[PDB]
Amino acid sequence: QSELDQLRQEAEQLKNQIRDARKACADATLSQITNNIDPVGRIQMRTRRTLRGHLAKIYAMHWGTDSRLLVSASQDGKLIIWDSYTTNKVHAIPLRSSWVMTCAYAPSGNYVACGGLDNICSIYNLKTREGNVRVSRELAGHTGYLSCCRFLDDNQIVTSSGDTTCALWDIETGQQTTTFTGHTGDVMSLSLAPDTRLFVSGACDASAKLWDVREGMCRQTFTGHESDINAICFFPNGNAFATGSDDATCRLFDLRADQELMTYSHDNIICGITSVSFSKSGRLLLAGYDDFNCNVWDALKADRAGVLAGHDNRVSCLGVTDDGMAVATGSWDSFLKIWN
Amino acid sequence: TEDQRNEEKAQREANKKIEKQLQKDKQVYRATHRLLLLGIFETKFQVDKVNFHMFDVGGQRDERRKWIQCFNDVTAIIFVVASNRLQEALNLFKSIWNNRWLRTISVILFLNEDYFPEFARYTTPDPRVTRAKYFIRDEFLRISTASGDGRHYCYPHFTCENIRRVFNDCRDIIQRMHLRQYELL
């Protein structure tokens, strides 16, 4: 087996050349050039209203592109469609399985999707002019648990999995249009580009890797973390993204500069991150910890821009509206409180 | 204001009808005690008019460290084990024991020698089968007594109709949680 090992040695010498290219672009840091800027200061957000009515732990949330409606999962098997302004439960959908890991809302504003531990991505319909809410189709193509769903449109929807495969689904047929491989872990979360062309997904392998949807190939793989990556969120311009981790660190990576820009961590923090998200401009990084609070970070100076400690029990998924008007945090205590 | 009042008059009935539906469903939800077994999958059934919603993990991969944190609302973690299956089962029982979230969740064990030199060093408190199964039983007790968590305790069983045995054991779990809720135990 000499040729296999020497071919792995050539793979090692040019990946060493890859590391040499990474040092080649490493001329400065983010903190040095962003040293001469004025931070936001202590910024205060208080709970404007709380949404009550879940019977068990809320595992997910997804906003709407109209910024009005928000969809929340739960442990009990009820995905409840909420109105944020008038705090009224607009819809309530009984799920087929009890455990659901994620929910999505259509950018058209016409469909919702549950993704659960039952290995099924199920799509529900809202625009039924006859009557109530139904199942349009359920999707079945993994041998592992579902972790996070996102929509491209009303017709093709992208799902990650714990079957090590991000996949692209089409609703008209119920089959995988393409299947993304290259990971070696549970694919935890994924976020689309703002022009919806490409998406990046975290994993178990401490490795968040960009994916091209047409090509179905591992474009580039960012490895700077220490344990499994829990949730990532894409930067609003389309050129960077920030990753949560398990070593209490947030890292923002650049797609073009191909390496770490900053590390958001304190030694006093030893708790794993559950979800991160950017604001509208991208200045603020809203990171929800297991210390039952979400810290607010400046994107450019790596300080606690604010501390947001409303919740009783830990968070599951926080989100920012598309206009940037309000931030809502789900939690494990059956109550999600919108913030502003 | 006719659009605003018609919108609110829509949400009046929609909120009251949906919150009323949830109020009806919540009493049914609390009436279910969920059990997780490791060792289509979901099964809910009746024992003495008690609803048990049970989940099988056979449709998952070997990696376990991030779908088991979804189960911190379960009442009991069943282990169906057998005979090197044993030592990795002791690894797994220790791994779920010392977990930061699952310190409150109890565990029920079921069973349904050349790796151990301690096997011959055992004293019994087929006799070879008897000394073997009580050696394994005490061996599992070694992790619980070694940790000393105090909130959850391992409940071993055997075979040679398990559902009445796990119902009565679950009754013990409910009594200990409800009793210690009054800061008594």
Epitope: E226 | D62, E63, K94, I96
Partner: nanobody
Framework: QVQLQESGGGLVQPGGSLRLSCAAS????????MNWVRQAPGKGLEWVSD????????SYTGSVKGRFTISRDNAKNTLYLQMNSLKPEDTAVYYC?????????????????????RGQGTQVTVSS
């Protein structure tokens, strides 16, 4: 990038003794928990032995009890295993494995497939 590389291994006689040295690279080694796992010939992965974060608390498999010993050096950023009166059945691929969580007491790393945080495995083989 968390890459684990382990030197040592090779051929040992029955009754021989040998040292396996695992080097840890790309992570803050002082925080985590280490363990060694075997791949038996034509069998699944089997857990052997672990250490605490300080190195004070060590567990073993029953078969490796009294004969094998493991110790970490955080300054040397490494883990060692030493054999004492080795047994000819032990012909195995030994992997140096990291527990996934910082500041923890539990590990989930006996999985045969697709666990990331492990080495490549010194083909520790015993002669006749």
């Amino acid at each position: 990038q968390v890459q684990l590389q382990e030197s040592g291994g090779g051929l040992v006689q029955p009754g021989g003794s040998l040292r396996l040295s695992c080097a840890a690279s790309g992570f803050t080694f002082s925080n985590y928990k280490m363990n060694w796992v075997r791949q038996a010939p034509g069998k699944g992965l089997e857990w052997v032995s672990d250490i605490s974060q300080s190195g004070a608390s060590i567990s073993y498999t029953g078969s490796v009890k009294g004969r094998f010993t493991i110790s970490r050096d955080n300054a040397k950023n490494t883990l060692y295993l030493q054999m004492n009166s080795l047994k000819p059945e032990d012909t195995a691929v030994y992997y140096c494995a990291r527990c996934p969580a910082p500041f923890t007491r539990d590990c989930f790393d006996v999985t045969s497939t697709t666990y990331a945080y492990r080495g490549q495995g010194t083909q520790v083989t015993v002669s006749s």
